[PDB]
Amino acid sequence: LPDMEETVNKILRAQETRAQLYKELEDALNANQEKKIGLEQMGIIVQLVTEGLNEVSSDIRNYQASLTKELKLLVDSLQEKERSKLQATVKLEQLKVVSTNSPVENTQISELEARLSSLSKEINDILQNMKDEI
């Protein structure tokens, strides 16, 4: 109930909507990679998915003012990862389709996958610190 941690619950509630939205996003990239989905459609689904991502991003910004300066920093870093995680996810699918499996192009995927794997691991640590009121 108190206004301090009530606002943190809404931030955690928005992260649920963001995590679910990437699942709809990721499933759309795989649908185009497996050639089950044309390039034209995937572009409009990302348009639909990034809109909900844009709503969640703006909702969490509104929740920042009532938070402590240590908590506003954790949110600031949280959105930086989620912004880079969005672009690194869509950019990864396109590079996997055009790549001729040459070693130069082949390690772009591994570097981005390692980036995505580390970004996701960093995000959960930001949430757990927010859960512990860091």
Tell how far CA 37 is from the center of its chain: 22
What are the Cα distances from residue 31, in Å, to 24, 94, 96, 115? Answer: 11, 12, 13, 22
Q: Indicate the resolution in Å.
A: 3.4
- What stretch of H or E contains 35? none
Would you call 47 helix, strand, or coil by DSSP? helix
Backbone torsions φ then ψ of 10, nearest 5 degrees: -65, -35
Which string of b and e fits 22-59 if b means at least 16 CB within 10 Å? Answer: beebeebbebbeeeebeeeebeebbeebeeebeebbee
Q: Looking at residue 109, which CATH number applies to its domain?
A: 1.20.120
**For the chain, what is the domain count?**
1
For CA atoms 111, 80, 60, 12, the dihedral sign is positive
Q: Which domain holds residue 18?
A: 3-131
Backbone torsions φ then ψ of 54, nearest 5 degrees: -70, -35
